[PDB]
């Protein structure tokens, strides 16, 4: 049953077991049916918490590598950290490949609404961005361009099909502005995108209902927080 797999994903989220939450939601997304707003959000939460733990682990092991890579040890010990980091990077890769495979084969082709189209292309940009984080050389550029075009596609649909105050559109602008700053190293693009999205939303904020207001203003503060910190780093 579909509503059973969705319910199990809820329990898995409460129990904070996100590997099972993914399995449940992946099964739902693997069906031809278009996901509801709740199932859409559950699927995203599932994969973000799964990819989040590995990313967090990766940064730590990378820091340990970099720290011990200065005089603290040599070769074989550093070798252990690198092989352990690579194991995580392999784990990160298959998680990204998994959701992207679901996105390309299932979600994106089956999306009727422009709201879900922006959402799915945003995710596509996100996990290609995660790939570009630990990647190096030519395989990093591939993930960078894949993330860029996925973000661009979502942006063209969001601008046309969605109001500036829409959570998915604001969230897309948040993540894409991050992509510009963190990955492509383009502070001008990043600041312009985050500020523009923030400004377009401000005007219509008073036209939003309560639940829409909370969702929108949450991301808008994140947009402001990024603009704040980016300003500090440039100084």
């Amino acid at each position: 049953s579909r509503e059973d797999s969705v319910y199990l994903a809820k329990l898995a989220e409460q129990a904070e077991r996100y590997e099972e939450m993914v399995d449940s939601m992946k099964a739902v997304a693997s069906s031809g049916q278009e996901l509801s707003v709740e199932e859409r959000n559950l699927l995203s939460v599932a994969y973000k918490n799964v990819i989040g733990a590995r990313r967090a682990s990766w940064r730590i092991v990378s820091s340990i590598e970099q720290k011990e890579e200065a005089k603290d040890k040599s070769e074989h010990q550093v070798k252990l950290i690198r092989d352990y980091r690579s194991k995580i990077e392999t784990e990160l890769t298959k998680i990204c490949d998994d959701i992207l495979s679901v996105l390309d084969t299932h979600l994106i082709p089956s999306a009727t609404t422009g709201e879900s189209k922006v959402f799915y292309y945003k995710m596509k940009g996100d996990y290609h961005r995660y790939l570009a984080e630990f990647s190096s050389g030519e395989v990093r550029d591939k993930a960078t361009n894949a993330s860029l075009e996925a973000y661009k596609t979502a942006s063209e649909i969001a601008t046309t099909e969605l109001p500036p105050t829409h959570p998915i559109r604001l969230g897309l602008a948040l993540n894409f502005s991050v992509f510009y700053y963190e990955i492509q190293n383009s502070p001008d693009k990043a600041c312009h995108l985050a500020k523009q999205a923030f400004d377009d939303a401000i005007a219509e904020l008073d036209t939003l209902s309560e639940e829409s207001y909370k969702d929108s203003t949450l991301i808008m503060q994140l947009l402001r927080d990024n603009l704040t910190l980016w300003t500090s780093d440039m100084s």
Binding site: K48, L172, I219, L222
Partner: peptide, 6 residues
Amino acid sequence: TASNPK
């Protein structure tokens, strides 16, 4: 830097 926490 913070991304969308959905």
